[PDB]
Task: inverse folding
């Protein structure tokens, strides 16, 4: 019985692009460039794109990259909600206990949707 | 010698076409599009940035707009007219400097800026590279033959959401007066991933073992 | 000697197979044998490997198989035409396949299996149609009829 | 007792049984034989005929959550969310080889009940994740958790 | 002090009820129904068959119809009124004889005639039992303490589709003149699965280790 | 989004039962009690309820048990096709090479839908 | 039957994929060794009675010429006082250690141990054994033949 | 191609002879002795016991003395003149009865009554048989095709020290008036180990897979 | 460092092993019919008294012969000789899971005097 | 951080679940042993240089009183001529075999081997060693202490 | 008490009972080990930095050079023939602007105990023994040490009777320093080669310390 | 019973040292400093101190370190034969196929007795 809509995505993104097609749908961003945020350890049952190695770590937001449904929703065909995505920079020493002080300036940058962030 | 994978590939493709999910033309069009992909546009973007500080600023702030200058429109170049389904439309160019050197990976899979760089290397897709680079980057880079001063910030970029990256390496010494073509020539795929840096006279990725396919093209 | 060095390297790789371990087979343990640590590990999303310890390997390039190029095109075409979004593909392909297949099978093997999977899960084809198509395809090969660009017909 | 130590020993040495242990890290297609292809793609619930050792069979007392899980799965079927065959396919096959034998019988029944809610979009994964956070907080705040823990 | 399983069970049940998939009453009704299940009706079916040739024939030919005589209607007894979703409505009774002895398993899972027999034993559900019984039945049965003449046909029934089975063992010696109740008393759950045969004086399954639960019913 | 029909099964099976509700939908059976049949080794990708240990073996049909959609279809929500299911008896020696001649009469009985059967 | 052969190969192959919690041991500290593990590691390898194992279709095996020669060598060494059979058992079925005990063949252990007693009791130096092996391999490679195993070419 | 085992066998034998540990003659003599071994003497002992109650008593009480009647002197038949180094000189004959049935194993290795029975079967030496028989004898015997009444005492004998055993099965029905030769003919090697019982008409061990050697005699 | 390669042959020729050790153990500590429990003596490096018998009780059914214990013989130490006993164990006393249906099954094996203590 | 601690425990735990083709070996026939396997099985266990391994956060370890005593015993046995250090290395790092070589602790091997040389060179019988172990355990059980490890 | 403590006591008492070594011998050896440490080696390096002639001697004849810091490889140990396990052939490896050494014993844990003390737990690990000879720059980086790519990193595998100590190059910022001041920054790790001397750093880099069940 | 000479080593080495006590016992060395030598892959059954990773590789002799019985003999109580030991330097690229050209000057130095050496 189920009927799958095979034209929805194309109709919405053609001539615009993804994630451009979701622009403006997230409303006002909760955080700004420069803010220090800690990654919440939200349940990861079945799916997540927020790597386990980042959970509980604190980093700095360096860019509000775009707006898009969270992968946790998009991957199951749920695109009703759109949120801000942030590029965050972590100090390597804050991720890996054994990281050498000799390489004190090394970092890791990755993207995380707003739902995983909390003011540090 | 036809393998289980070849039997299944054919089964899936025939069924999809029979059910009208995609057309025989769609499949040919996608394969032909992929055949046109490669590292040349990305290398040209880097050369152009080295040769024009104002373009470099654009590359760093808006990779999508900058990409248009090398003939790769992330929205309209792909057959979809909405960017490729898997690479999306948010290219970011990471600019190395005397105090910063970037290297890219997709720990969750193999996310790569295909529209401007081509297909990902076999090793880039390996569980090994995906496990190690984010944690032991200096050790992994050394294995690739790249070492940076200890005070230089090595930044590993994990391409986990809709952004894809290319690395704009620092222009090497020994290239005074070089043309755009000369400069683009030394910016290899490996330099754009970040596991190598451009060097005058080196115009191909470092030689590595090549595992042969049972049935290549 | 090249032959001696080859045997040396084969040896270094072979002894790894004999590395001692406390190997505990798991046969549907009771709930009382599952700690929170084990629960999180078993319910992990397979694709999340960043930070896991691994050894140095001599990275290699690999030639593309014709079937891999065709599989890639099929997956993007299915998305282009709305059967799924790339995120739905990743979730099914890199996670739903489970730990064993995730690391035991090839990269594109998972892409292909998952392309077949979406056809069945969204009922565009019945599993019966897929099974039947595979049976028919094998017959084509076995008969000498050829298989597309993978095997030409046997002739006169 | 000595006999207890003897039996613990007999069980422990099995952990040390020598083997040629070949870790698999996404092998190339050329490393997959038809035999391996069939073994990797078979449905895990099909174990009849596989060699196994003699074990002293035991009965197991039922967990309250197992009784609730069973009722939940049958109620979801009774009310048309799925048929039992859809459940079996998802529960005993789709879970994959590792979870199939590494987790408990009812653990799979439960994970799959959660799975059908998300796959058929009756709840979003976000709603499920949020609900898990809610249950944990209910427990942490001393509000109890159904019949498992009183306030 | 509450496990990940208990946390998830609560989450799934509350979500299901919130979305109107099933109600709290539905869940309570199902739990109560299962709580009433047991091997008594099956044992009584066997005893009746031993005492009535015509009923025995019915048991062998149409288990669903025979089950009605002991109060278990496979279609109407379950809350659904269309049989339980997982056990279906096709019970078959396997009759042992001097030359035939049956034992049951579900190699693909744990398929069991719940409506007339109750919940399955933990071991019946084990990968071990599911791997071995179909291939080494005499060895497995011997472990259970049951041995049959070598010339007797041991038949293993693998409940893989919609049919569920109960074994009707042969009536043992030493029960002359026994009443239906006396006969039903020795037909234990294990006898109905096929890993044991009825014996005068034995009215409960053979004792075996019992693994305790972390939080069983109080 | 797709809509799932949650009333179909109950409307069809209430007061009748499963598989009783599929009675007569398979048409004439291809085989009959007493027929010797070999089990076809059909692809088992994603799902099957015809155990691997039976593939290629020959047995005797002892009963046409009922009509029903094959599990291979029912498990994916496809119930449009209904076929005959057969209870088949295999000699243990034909399944397991090592089975002892001492236990010459031992057998295994299980159910298999028509699609897997071919005249022996 | 080609299909039955594939079925049996399958049943044997899936055993390789049996899930397990595989803990590699890399010279753990003393604090990681319990009494239970100490007893298991210091066990005498040949003592396997009572250990759980699966049913296997037992086979007979033809005797290799080298196995017959090895057996005779071991009994002759005992006959002539180089060792008693008990000394052989201890060295052969226990001293070889867990891995070799189950990874190598029955007569492979008998043979390795015959070589071992020659060296341990100093009847030959390890150097003489190593040299003899080198010479034997050269003998084979040259076409000179190897006893009853290979005639001169 | 010659294997690593054949190379080492030759190396060990040549060194032993060169160092005077044993002579080339000694090795030939031992191989010749082994070649004369087999199950025939043990089968004759059983047949003789079935036909002579007094001899049967002797077999049960003093196997070493009884063995002499079938031409196998445990002390003097072997080349050593002190029994074989590995089989020793203490044979015990285990008498089955309507209430007792024996089966033998050497859980520690492969201890077997070679002087009177020949070489051990490959499966008898297997870790599998050595692990299982002492704990699940009814199951292992059933796999071999042998089952006994539940009330009968099955006794597993573990040959762990200097004693070696042979099983004297009960005489089967259907052999009325049979000669010693006829009776001995149905007492196979497997009957003497205990994994099978004698049956009229069966004069060879039950057929089972035979793994071929790379280079047999 | 020289090895005596004639000792064993000189002692056992024309006599046999274990016959050559007859009378060397003196008086046996136990008799046929005695119930004995197997002591769990340390087994470091070597033992021929199976782990599965440790702590179990059995019945002595025969004093088989006298011989140095294997624990000594396997290391070239033959100065001490002791009595060896054949002991019968009820299977149920060795394996917890053994079925009551097979209540008469047993296991017989040999153990030197050092491992025995009266039950 | 409790979360970071859980993260790191997780990264370590999933390693236990790494998929593999696990082939148990139960005394294979000679025809199943290739030259490659023969060389690998007959290898000297201590020769590990060049073998692939992962990065580990190296730690220092506090010395056990028994380790210090074991070391002294081994050097004293050599000083006094029971063995040379090379005989010790061969017995301790090679003869122990693959399993014990990596399954037991470094000094556990030194100690086992010290006990071993006493028995192999017949300075003590195995019986004397077994009896002594029983004696040590009884000394502890009876409350008489055990050297500097346990006071009476 | 543990199985190891039970066995240690058994072995020691039996050895003494059989007259293999005496209780006094055992105490003599433990006392000797207690006198060992990394200081003599550090002093040798400091002296070499201040005396070119002595440095040459260190490089050519480590055994003779060792005498200058009071460690005679033959006569200092109780045996008077060198320790049984460390022998008498110390070699000093001199780093330079173009060469940097690091040491390991892939076969075990061979270490210059007489002049350096007991070996670190990690030095004995299968891990260090497997990796250093093949991926030295990666292992050294983990230890926090990196050298120019053109500099020759030399790994010395102590597999026979030679034991090594590394003489690092003298670092900047030590002009006019005394022998004591210089020796103070030459830590055990510098003598193994996993670290280089730095003014102000007088102890090995802090690392996790695994505690013993029953230490001294 | 065999008697072990527990005074031999001390009598030979006291006041002299090991390997100093073997000085002059090897005779004339077969190789000299500067010679290029390849490591022979001699059988390694039971014991060896010439690492497998060096087999078949070529290196340069940089020092004749001392004379001593080979460990292969010393470890089994055989000290009658004494041979020259050489310190050999190998280019890392000649040992490990994957070694990077970037670290072109890296080396490995280790000791090997004369029996394992052959002129390159
Ligand atoms: O006929 C169906 C009825 O049967 C009775 O035995 C049950 O108690 C009812 O719950 C059920 O509805
Ligand atoms: O060829 C396989 C690679 O892995 C090893 O066998 C073991 O680390 C290497 O020596 C070789 O280069
Ligand atoms: O070899 C593995 C074992 O499993 C099978 O392949 C299939 O049941 C058997 O024939 C074999 O004995
Ligand atoms: O005998 C040669 C020896 O003498 C020196 O050149 C000077 O003492 C040493 O380094 C070397 O070992
Ligand atoms: Co990716
Ligand atoms: Co089931
Ligand atoms: Co034996
Ligand atoms: Co060492």
Result:
């Amino acid at each position: 019985k189920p009927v799958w809509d095979r034209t929805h995505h194309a109709k919405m993104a053609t001539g615009i692009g993804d994630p451009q097609c979701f622009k403006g749908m997230a409303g006002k961003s909760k955080f700004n460039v420069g803010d220090r945020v800690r990654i919440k350890d939200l349940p990861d049952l079945f799916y997540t794109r927020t790597m386990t190695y980042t959970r509980g770590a604190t980093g700095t937001i360096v860019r509000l990259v775009y707006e898009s449904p969270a992968a946790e929703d998009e991957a199951f065909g749920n695109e009703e909600n759109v949120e801000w995505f942030y590029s965050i920079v972590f100090a390597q020493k804050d991720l890996w206990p054994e990281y050498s002080d000799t390489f004190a300036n090394d970092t890791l940058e990755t993207e995380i949707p707003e739902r995983y962030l909390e003011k540090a | 010698e036809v393998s289980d994978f070849e039997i299944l590939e054919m089964a899936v493709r025939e069924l999809a076409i029979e059910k009208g999910l995609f057309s025989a033309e769609d499949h040919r069009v996608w394969k032909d599009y992929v055949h046109t992909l490669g590292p040349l546009p990305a290398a040209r973007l880097v050369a152009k940035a080295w040769l024009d500080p104002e373009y470099k600023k654009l590359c760093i702030e808006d990779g999508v707009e900058a990409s248009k200058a090398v003939g790769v429109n992330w929205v309209t170049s792909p057959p979809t007219q909405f960017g490729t389904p898997s690479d999306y439309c948010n290219l970011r160019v990471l600019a190395d400097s005397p105090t910063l050197k970037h290297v890219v990976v997709c720990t969750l899979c193999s996310c790569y800026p295909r529209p401007i760089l081509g297909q990902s290397p076999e090793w880039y897709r390996s569980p090994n590279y995906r496990r190690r680079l984010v944690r032991w980057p200096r050790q992994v880079l050394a294995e690739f033959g790249l070492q940076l001063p200890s005070e230089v910030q090595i930044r590993v970029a994990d391409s986990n959401q809709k952004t894809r990256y290319i690395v704009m390496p620092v222009r090497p010494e020994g290239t005074d007066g070089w043309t755009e073509d000369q400069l683009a020539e030394i910016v290899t795929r490996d330099c754009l991933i970040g596991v190598a840096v451009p060097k005058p006279g080196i115009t191909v990725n470092a030689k590595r073992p090549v595992l042969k396919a049972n049935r290549p093209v | 000697s090249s032959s001696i060095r080859e045997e040396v390297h084969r040896h270094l790789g072979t002894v790894a197979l004999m590395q001692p371990a406390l190997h505990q087979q798991t046969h549907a343990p009771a709930p009382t044998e599952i700690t929170h640590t084990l629960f999180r590990a078993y319910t992990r999303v397979p694709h999340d490997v960043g930070g896991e310890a691994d050894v140095p390997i001599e990275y290699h390039e690999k030639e593309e198989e014709i079937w891999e190029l065709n599989t890639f095109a099929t997956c993007e075409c299915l998305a282009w035409r709305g059967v799924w979004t790339a995120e739905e593909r990743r979730r099914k392909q890199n996670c739903d396949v489970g730990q064993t297949v995730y690391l035991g099978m090839p990269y594109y093997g998972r892409w292909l299996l998952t392309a077949a999977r979406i056809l069945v899960d969204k009922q565009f084809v019945t599993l019966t149609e897929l099974h039947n198509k595979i049976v028919e395809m094998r017959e084509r090969v076995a008969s000498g009829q050829g298989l597309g660009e993978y095997l030409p017909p046997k002739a006169k």
User: Anything to note?
Assistant: Chains F and L do not touch (no CB pair under 8 Å). DSSP finds two helices and five strands in chain F. Strands of chain F lie at 36-39, 58-68, 83-91, 107-113, 117-119.
